[PDB]
Amino acid sequence: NSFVGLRVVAKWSSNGYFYSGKITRDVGAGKYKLLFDDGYECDVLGKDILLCDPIPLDTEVTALSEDEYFSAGVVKGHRKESGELYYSIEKEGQRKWYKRMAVILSLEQGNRLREQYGLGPYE
């Protein structure tokens, strides 16, 4: 048994930022059989939709504000319940508990991690 019910990030093309996903089963070497945190399922190769925390417990990440123009706040405490999801983003001096889609992350906040926790098992 392992991470076949894992916590994931969602990038289709590398365009500099990722959305959120959750896994259902593991598909081969490099792949994940996944559904988005909001209900969109597929099987894909992982360097797109992969095994995350999502991101490090010290992370000034981006919070859902505009498309190229979004603003940062910090991941500190997070959990996932059997049909409820909450990520505590420390923002504006207070904690915003959002299901993972109200946070985003960019590639280099992903790439720092990519080798150690998730953001690429395959090349």
Same-domain check for residues 6 and 29:
yes
Provide Rg for the chain, Cα atoms.
14
What residues have CB less than 8 Å from 1, skipping those under 6 apart?
none
Residue 94 tokens, joined: 């207070």
Question: Beta strand 71-81 with 84-91: parallel, antiparallel or unpaired?
Answer: antiparallel
Q: Would you tell me how many other CB atoms lie within 10 Å of the CB of residue 100?
A: 25
CATH of the domain at 37: 2.30.30.140
Residue 103 tokens, joined: 């946070």
Structural domains of the chain, count = 2
Method: NMR
CATH of the domain at 91: 2.30.30.30
Angstrom distance (rounded) from CA 48 to CA 88: 24
Residue-range definition of the domain harbouring residue 76: 56-123
